[PDB]
Design an enzyme around this catalytic site. Structure first.
Site, PDB file in Angstrom:
ATOM      1  N   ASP A   1       0.813  -1.223   0.000  1.00  0.00           N
ATOM      2  CA  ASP A   1       0.000   0.000   0.000  1.00  0.00           C
ATOM      3  C   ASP A   1       0.854   1.285   0.000  1.00  0.00           C
ATOM      4  OD1 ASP A   1       1.039  -0.245   2.557  1.00  0.00           O
ATOM      5  OD2 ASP A   1      -0.836   0.177   3.616  1.00  0.00           O
TER       6      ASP A   1
ATOM      7  N   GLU B   1       1.627 -10.912   0.947  1.00  0.00           N
ATOM      8  CA  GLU B   1       1.926  -9.493   0.854  1.00  0.00           C
ATOM      9  C   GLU B   1       3.427  -9.361   1.164  1.00  0.00           C
ATOM     10  OE1 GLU B   1       0.195  -5.015   1.891  1.00  0.00           O
ATOM     11  OE2 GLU B   1      -0.734  -6.745   2.848  1.00  0.00           O
TER      12      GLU B   1
HETATM   13  O1  LIG Z   1      -5.548  -4.700   5.841  1.00  0.00           O
HETATM   14  C1  LIG Z   1      -5.309  -5.876   5.118  1.00  0.00           C
HETATM   15  C2  LIG Z   1      -4.827  -5.597   3.669  1.00  0.00           C
HETATM   16  O2  LIG Z   1      -5.879  -4.854   2.962  1.00  0.00           O
HETATM   17  C3  LIG Z   1      -5.459  -4.587   1.598  1.00  0.00           C
HETATM   18  O3  LIG Z   1      -6.498  -3.889   0.971  1.00  0.00           O
HETATM   19  C4  LIG Z   1      -7.807  -4.498   0.763  1.00  0.00           C
HETATM   20  C5  LIG Z   1      -8.809  -3.939   1.773  1.00  0.00           C
HETATM   21  O4  LIG Z   1      -8.492  -4.345   3.077  1.00  0.00           O
HETATM   22  C6  LIG Z   1     -10.148  -4.651   1.430  1.00  0.00           C
HETATM   23  O5  LIG Z   1     -11.143  -4.147   2.324  1.00  0.00           O
HETATM   24  C7  LIG Z   1     -10.517  -4.227  -0.005  1.00  0.00           C
HETATM   25  O6  LIG Z   1     -10.667  -2.866  -0.148  1.00  0.00           O
HETATM   26  O7  LIG Z   1      -9.504  -4.790  -0.905  1.00  0.00           O
HETATM   27  C8  LIG Z   1      -8.182  -4.217  -0.645  1.00  0.00           C
HETATM   28  C9  LIG Z   1      -7.233  -4.800  -1.643  1.00  0.00           C
HETATM   29  O8  LIG Z   1      -7.103  -6.184  -1.447  1.00  0.00           O
HETATM   30  C10 LIG Z   1      -4.220  -3.710   1.588  1.00  0.00           C
HETATM   31  O9  LIG Z   1      -3.914  -3.523   0.214  1.00  0.00           O
HETATM   32  C11 LIG Z   1      -3.103  -4.432   2.288  1.00  0.00           C
HETATM   33  O10 LIG Z   1      -1.956  -3.618   2.355  1.00  0.00           O
HETATM   34  C12 LIG Z   1      -3.585  -4.733   3.733  1.00  0.00           C
HETATM   35  O11 LIG Z   1      -2.540  -5.440   4.426  1.00  0.00           O
HETATM   36 MG   LIG Z   2      -1.510  -4.761   6.223  1.00  0.00          MG
END
Ligand SMILES: OC[C@H]1O[C@@H](O[C@H]2[C@H](O)[C@@H](O)[C@@H](O)O[C@@H]2CO)[C@H](O)[C@@H](O)[C@@H]1O
Ligand SMILES: [Mg+2]
Ligand SMILES: OC[C@H]1O[C@H](O)[C@H](O)[C@@H](O)[C@@H]1O
Ligand SMILES: [Ca+2]
Ligand SMILES: [Ca+2]
Ligand SMILES: [Ca+2]
Ligand SMILES: [Ca+2]
Ligand SMILES: [Mg+2]
Ligand SMILES: [Mg+2]
Ligand SMILES: [Mg+2]
Lengths: 612, 613
Positions: free
Chosen positions: A56, A418
């Site tokens: 992210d 991740e």
């Molecule tokens: O917090 C866990 C991981 O979330 C990831 O993003 C997700 C989000 O949590 C979901 O609610 C939805 O929006 O899909 C997103 C993409 O998979 C985030 O990208 C990771 O960094 C977090 O660890």
């Molecule tokens: Mg995370």
């Protein structure tokens, strides 16, 4: 047999791809560029820089400072390995990258910005760092709203950076110490994480006395002021005990939320007190031979497995501590070989002992779909497209397998797939130790300048409307940029015609009527007929998209559709689109396809397609 | 544009019927193919008749032949609903059985396998229809001492896939197929060598056999439900060819007669759900569609995925088939399903007409008119250039295809881009069955290929050879231009009619006139004396019999027989009048013969050309 030097080189490089802010001119990649350039603008402070946390774009200072403190700890322990591998400059640049940002985050005594970005908003969009469009609020702690863990974790990073930079850059070391002292004072006065709330759901803190001890140890090593060593030891009774006992916790491992493992290891080396020696050996024994009838679980293939999330992160971090402790004269002699065997077995599991590598761009069958926005490079806000990562984020250690060695290399699997700053922190130090012991040469002059694998800006077109005196085109320009991802606000395209038949009719080709019944974007401008090569009766219509904020971050965001028509007078029948360069092959309907005869220009320079 | 997938499917299956060698069924739906290669295997005392001719030639090459029937069976196994709905199930099963009955004949005793009938050099040195081939057609075999792992395993795959699709309706046949498949696979498995596979060098050389081993093993597993075979199929994977500078299974080519690991890994992914196979087939399909890791198959400007110079359409349509099958499997990466289905349609549509013309003979807009094919062309003079058009329409044949810039020329000796062959249509048929399932298009009901006869099959040309006050001497040349079907005509005769009123009036016996021949081409030619036809009207005739002559449409000298004959009034007389003779009217006066219609030609006594008085 694994090349530990190459692994070390790539692990350090990993952080370069996580960088936010104004990137150095000396960067060795062609797919990361300036991003988060307005970080801190909401509070009037330059907060640019630092590293994005994981897959992210939020800058979470707790795991970020944990990371730089761990990298500096490795450099402090094994400078000879970095020098021999020729990687010293790179790890120091990384440590300085993080610490320069923490310094910016402490703009005045008593104030500390601990985050830039909102977890929820940041995670709601899947695209490259360079084109983020959402707000990125800054968050701070002070005396009225404390953040002991994040302030102390930052002080530890700054003080450890001071230790490893003092020989070559004594002034920067002093700069780091000044800020470490202020942040530690803030943390020590407050003894509370009550104001540390912006990271809720991602990096909420479950302890701060461990951070106070860890920072105090590093400030002691940086300043030699015993005031800090006394404080470091004073917090020990306040560290969490192992459930069901009055013994210092030993069943977890060093990580961004719990640094008492590293603090006690260091206190053992600094004081030789039995309390610390017993505590760190109890933790290391739990992870290896087992202790008092208990032992961390091991997967069938040899991975010391602590938890579902980031199993490799935990195992490789413990490997690093085991390596450091095993080298100390105070380690129980009989355990030295046990701890060193553990360091090797865990690092080898990460590098390839199961038959495949868990390090991106390294070894045999490395992961190809890590959960990472910028490395993937979607231009449509979709984790699913493209179906392969556009970039190779070298050195990234993925989360890791489940308790039974199960692992699925899929982009949506953020639990086991991740990649993150903290995942590679301890890993980097363990790799330095394996390199000094078993070698493996780093790739000479290693860079990550990638081949452009897709046309960055393209145009699709089709015949929208036709008649005896006109041709109407539907064209769609697409921004599929990735080297680096970028806003394309100076795009235009040209539609070429041969107007020999207009000249033959005694009509001025410049008098033909051009028009547009539809267009996405407010700045879209379709010109009148313009001359291009009149000696061959070639004229064209210029379609300008300059000013349009076209960027690779959404289905609508990355494209601009334009419908335009060129027409001879009503009732005439001499108009002939068949001798027009841009008409050849053009799809017969409004189903548009990629065309190579309606060239696209970026600030007047042709980047796609062909001219007559 | 819209394309009729059912008609394409029905024609693609029919193409194989035109490739048939051997004793053709009475149920045949064409009037231009007949019995051929009837002595196949006679050199070794084994009945090796049947099977399919490979391409535009008459050699029976078992490697691509078995690859073909295995691919057709795979299509029937995957999409029986498409065949049933389109009413083509019977036709495809008959084709699969045609090939497999021949492979069974080729494994006459355990441990021996005949892998070829016909010598490439001897066969290609003559341009004519299958029915009248005159050259030796040697048989070739492999055994433990001279192995052929690739061809034995490819044949086993064909026989095992046939068993899978025939089990429900004909368990006894499926059981017979399995028995032979097991022997051929065991031979291939034990040998692990193509050392004895030599007769096809230059045409169908084998560059790999481990792929064939897995492919055969997978099909034997499906036919027997015995996991011994699944274990075997998986064991050869480490020996499959890899990508040049990696230890990754090859993915930059495509399913074809020489390389079946693509089909094998696709089936293995479906049967085991192992990531290794899923990854492998998706890397291949990704290379063919969106590209993978900076690598993608070349695409022509008009949309054809172009792999190689030869059989570009063959490769593209075969990959379309694999993409279609894989896209329907629950295990396929969800986000690639539409990409794969789009590819299936785009490639098939290119073959069918997306560029503005069809590349399938006898189908769609402006289809190819001159595919490189001996029997469809129908030369009766051993000439690729004559006639200048094809006498037959070989419906359904997919031509080689264009070059990488969409360039294509429809000429008989554009042996590259205009070649047609069994393997070219194999994957194609499967891909069409998927498109028909997806988008329909009605096949032509009870479609047959009963062609109108476009040239008189047996003709006679004649001219005045010599003339005198008491005689007429004719030069006649009979031509066998048969094509429906091409055939030997050894019972041909013709009649020359005269009015002998002047002979009777002069007081001379008309039946006494001397008939003679100063030149005859054949040893069996017989010229009768003067015979009565309609005595009341003074009409008489001379019968010229060519019975016994092996006249056939396979050469300039083979297809014709010249005969010169003379009828004479008494020496020294001047009342002979040829001008009232029916057969003399309009007769070319020089000697340069021209086709005539007043010297009727008979085949076994039945008039087939010309007119009687
Ligand atoms: O917090 C866990 C991981 O979330 C990831 O993003 C997700 C989000 O949590 C979901 O609610 C939805 O929006 O899909 C997103 C993409 O998979 C985030 O990208 C990771 O960094 C977090 O660890
Ligand atoms: Mg995370
Ligand atoms: O592609 C799957 C999903 O990936 C990411 O979560 C994107 O933000 C979302 O828009 C998309 O639907
Ligand atoms: Ca803590
Ligand atoms: Ca024009
Ligand atoms: Ca092979
Ligand atoms: Ca007469
Ligand atoms: Mg700059
Ligand atoms: Mg012109
Ligand atoms: Mg018969």
């Amino acid at each position: 047999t694994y090349n530990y030097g190459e692994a070390l080189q790539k692990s350090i490089m990993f952080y370069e791809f996580q960088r936010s802010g104004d990137l150095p001119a000396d960067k060795r990649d062609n797919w990361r560029d300036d991003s988060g350039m307005k970080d801190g603008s909401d509070v009037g402070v330059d907060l640019t820089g630092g590293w994005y946390d994981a897959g992210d774009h939020v800058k979470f200072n707790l795991p970020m400072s944990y990371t730089s403190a761990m990298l500096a700890w490795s450099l402090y322990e094994d400078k000879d390995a970095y020098d021999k591998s020729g990687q010293t400059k790179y790890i120091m640049d990384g440590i300085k990258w993080a610490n320069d940002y923490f310094i910016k985050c402490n703009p005045t005594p008593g104030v500390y910005y601990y985050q830039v970005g909102d977890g929820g908003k940041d995670h709601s969009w899947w695209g490259p760092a360079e084109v983020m469009q959402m707000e990125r609020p800054s968050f701070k702690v002070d005396a009225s709203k404390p953040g002991s863990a994040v302030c102390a974790s930052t002080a530890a990073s700054l003080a450890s950076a001071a230790v490893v930079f003092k020989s070559s850059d004594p002034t920067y070391a002093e700069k780091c110490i000044s800020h470490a002292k202020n942040l530690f004072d803030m943390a020590d006065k407050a003894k509370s994480d009550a104001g540390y709330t912006a990271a809720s759901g991602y990096y909420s803190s479950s302890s701060f006395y461990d951070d106070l001890s860890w920072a105090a140890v590093w400030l002691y090593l940086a300043t030699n002021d015993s005031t800090y060593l006394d404080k470091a030891e004073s917090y020990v009774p306040n560290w969490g005990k192992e459930q069901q006992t009055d013994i210092i916790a030993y069943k977890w491992g060093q990580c961004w939320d719990d640094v008492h493992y590293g603090a006690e290891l260091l206190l053992a080396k600094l004081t030789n007190k039995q309390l610390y020696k017993d505590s760190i050996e109890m933790n290391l024994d739990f992870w290896t031979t087992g202790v008092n009838g208990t032992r961390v679980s091991y997967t069938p293939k040899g991975l010391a497995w602590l938890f579902q999330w980031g199993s490799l992160r935990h195992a490789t971090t413990q490997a690093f501590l085991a390596g450091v402790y095993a080298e100390w004269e105070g380690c129980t002699p009989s355990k030295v070989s046990v701890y060193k065997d553990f360091l090797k077995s865990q690092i080898d599991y990460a590098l390839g002992s199961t038959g495949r590598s868990f390090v991106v761009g390294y070894g045999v069958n490395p992961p190809q779909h890590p959960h990472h926005r910028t490395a993937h490079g979607s231009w449509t806000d979709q984790m699913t497209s493209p179906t392969y990562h556009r970039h190779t984020i070298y050195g990234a250690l993925v989360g890791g397998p489940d308790n039974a060695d199960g692992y699925t290399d899929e982009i949506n699997n953020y639990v086991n797939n991740e990649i993150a700053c903290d995942y590679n922190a301890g890993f980097t130090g363990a790799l330095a130790k394996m390199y000094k012991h078993s070698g493996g040469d780093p790739i000479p002059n290693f860079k990550a300048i990638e081949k452009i694998t897709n046309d960055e800006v393209i145009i699709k077109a089709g015949l929208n409307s036709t008649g005896p005196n006109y041709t109407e085109i539907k064209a769609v320009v697409y921004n599929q940029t990735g080297w680096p991802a970028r806003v394309t606000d100076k795009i235009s395209f040209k539609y070429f015609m041969d107007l020999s038949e207009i000249v033959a009719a005694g009509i001025d080709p410049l008098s033909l009527v051009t028009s547009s019944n539809y267009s996405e974007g407010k700045n879209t401008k379709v010109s009148g007929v313009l001359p291009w090569d009149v000696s061959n009766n070639v004229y064209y219509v210029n379609v300008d998209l300059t000013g349009e904020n076209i960027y690779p971050g959404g289905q609508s965001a990355c494209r601009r559709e334009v419908q335009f028509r060129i027409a001879a007078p009503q009732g005439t029948t001499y108009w002939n689109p068949k001798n027009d360069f841009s008409y050849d092959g053009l799809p017969t309907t409004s189903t548009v396809n990629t065309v190579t005869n309606i060239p696209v220009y970026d600030n007047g320079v042709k980047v796609f397609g062909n001219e007559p």
